[PDB]
């Protein structure tokens, strides 16, 4: 109910909400191009299959977690150390596994993988990668918020919160990658031994 | 003759860091960080964004005279607004 004795700017139209799903407001000076995406940041669209990205903190879509990092790489393989065993380095010839045997004999030599050992280690490594990446939980979220100029205390609280969680997750992501790469390489050296 | 136990070696140049060692070459690694974007603003899930361009949210909803192209209100996948819009 509207009532006025003056100074009223009345609506002519109202806006019915017809669809209420999640979206968000993105701040950018670019324009729409004739392309498609499942995840969009202010700097451009991303086509991803990995758990983390370093493009921008804000995004609209089903996206990887943002970290403040240039590099997160998980070793899955062996230290690539280029007639001699693990002491010297890797026999170049083997492509059928990770760990294996030379088998020299009088019928003829030839390298072959140890399938039992490689397969157990292989599943160990794939389970490890999955434990590392499946623990990241993201969701569609309109992350950005706007505050007025009289809400500096709240804006700063919000920013601190977001920066705080970014530091925690960047730390956890980098630390986990480094701790796991150390163990991955020890794991592989242990398995050859 | 002898049987040797060894491991794979490759021509991979991919390197990783560990807590106590840095710049270590490995035969395989999984890069788990996405470092690229295409630089374009696209249609999210096949549905275009609302393109306000020069218009602000208040401009759009109130009907700024210069935002007369937004009166058609199509379905949005996201709202695209310039930082510090004019209209």
């Amino acid at each position, epitope marked *: 109910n509207f009532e006025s004795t003056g100074n009223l700017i009345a609506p002519e139209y109202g806006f019915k909400i017809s669809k209420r799903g999640s979206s968000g407001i993105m701040k950018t*000076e*670019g324009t729409l*191009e004739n392309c498609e995406t499942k995840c969009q*940041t*202010p*700097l*451009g669209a991303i086509n991803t299959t990995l758990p983390f990205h*370093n*493009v*921008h*903190p*804000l995004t609209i879509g089903e996206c990887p977690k943002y*970290v*403040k*990092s*240039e590099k997160l790489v998980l070793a899955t393989g062996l230290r690539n150390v280029p007639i001699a065993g693990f002491i010297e380095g890797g026999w170049q010839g083997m492509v059928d596994g990770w760990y294996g045997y030379h088998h020299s004999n009088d019928q003829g030599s030839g390298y072959a993988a140890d399938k039992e050992s490689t397969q157990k280690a292989f599943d160990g490594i794939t389970n490890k990668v999955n434990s590392v990446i499946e623990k990241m939980n993201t969701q569609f979220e309109a992350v950005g918020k706007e505050f007025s100029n009289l809400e500096r205390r709240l804006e700063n609280l919000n920013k601190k919160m*977001e*920066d705080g969680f*970014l530091d925690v997750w960047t730390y956890n992501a980098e630390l986990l990658v480094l701790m796991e790469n150390e163990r991955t390489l020890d794991f592989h050296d242990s398995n050859v031994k | 003759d002898q049987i040797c136990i060894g491991y794979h070696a490759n021509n991979s140049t991919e390197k990783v860091d560990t807590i106590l060692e840095r710049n270590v070459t490995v035969t395989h690694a999984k890069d788990i960080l996405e*470092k*690229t974007h*295409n*630089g*374009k603003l696209c249609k999210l899930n096949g549905i275009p964004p609302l393109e306000l361009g020069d218009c602000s949210i208040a401009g759009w909803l109130l009907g700024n005279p210069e935002c007369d192209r937004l009166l058609s209100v199509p379905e949005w996948s996201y709202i695209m607004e310039k*930082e*510090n819009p004019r209209d």
Partner: antibody, heavy 126, light 107 residues
């Protein structure tokens, strides 16, 4: 390692088209995922940003040149080029190409220009 | 778009003196300010990026800091070699802009 080198006609007459080419060396133009920029200095005046191109064809420009400017790249030769139509005395400047790198940050990638070329002077006269 | 105001327009200082140059943005540029040093005859060199980080190879006498809308370049222990115009660059938006350039003379 990364160097940028530039060349062009030197002299452009009024109302002609100015065309400059930057050759990127030691940095694959199509693989870095970096933005390539054009910047210029008119006599007396300070640095003015012209525009940039992504490793792909997405291109942005300084709005003051929107009626006159085009930027493009040829991946095959690691080259960038700048084209300005309706060139006049105001366009006399030292032109420079530069590479845009970044720092991941709390607000998103924080961009800066590390590698610059030597630049070249274009004179506009009759 | 976002304009940059740089001040002083010029400085004069002796060898061993410390000076400051500042940047003021018309809008919030959130730690996206870069500083450049331009010696005559050369393309500008990056000194400071992301408000306070020095570029590799930049002498330790250079430093700076700042926050939304206000940043400072500090040059301590000025040497005869630190003769240059210094520029403010705002990387926050797409239509990237620069300040006017501060001309610092060394005695």
């Amino acid at each position: 390692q990364v160097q940028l080198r530039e060349s062009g006609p030197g002299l452009v007459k009024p109302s002609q088209t100015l065309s400059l080419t930057c050759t990127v060396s030691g940095d694959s133009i199509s693989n870095g995922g970096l933005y390539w920029n054009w910047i210029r200095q008119r006599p007396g005046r300070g640095l003015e940003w012209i525009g940039y191109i992504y490793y792909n064809g997405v291109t942005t420009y300084n709005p003051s040149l929107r009626s006159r400017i085009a930027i493009s790249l040829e991946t095959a030769k690691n080259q960038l080029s700048l084209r300005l139509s309706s060139v006049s005395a105001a366009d006399t400047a030292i032109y420079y190409c530069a590479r845009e790198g970044w720092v991941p940050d709390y607000g998103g990638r924080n961009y800066y220009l590390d590698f610059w070329g030597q630049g070249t002077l274009v004179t506009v006269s009759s | 778009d976002i304009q940059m105001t740089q001040s002083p327009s010029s400085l004069s200082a002796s060898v061993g003196d410390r000076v400051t140059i500042t940047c003021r943005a018309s809008h919030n540029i959130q730690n996206f300010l870069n500083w450049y040093q331009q010696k005559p005859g050369k393309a500008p060199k990056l000194l400071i990026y992301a408000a306070s980080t020095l570029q590799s190879g930049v002498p330790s006498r250079f430093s700076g800091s700042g926050s939304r809308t206000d940043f400072t370049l500090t040059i301590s222990s000025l040497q005869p070699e630190d003769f240059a115009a210094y520029y403010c660059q705002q990387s926050y938006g797409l239509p990237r802009t620069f300040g006017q350039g501060t001309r610092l003379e060394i005695k």
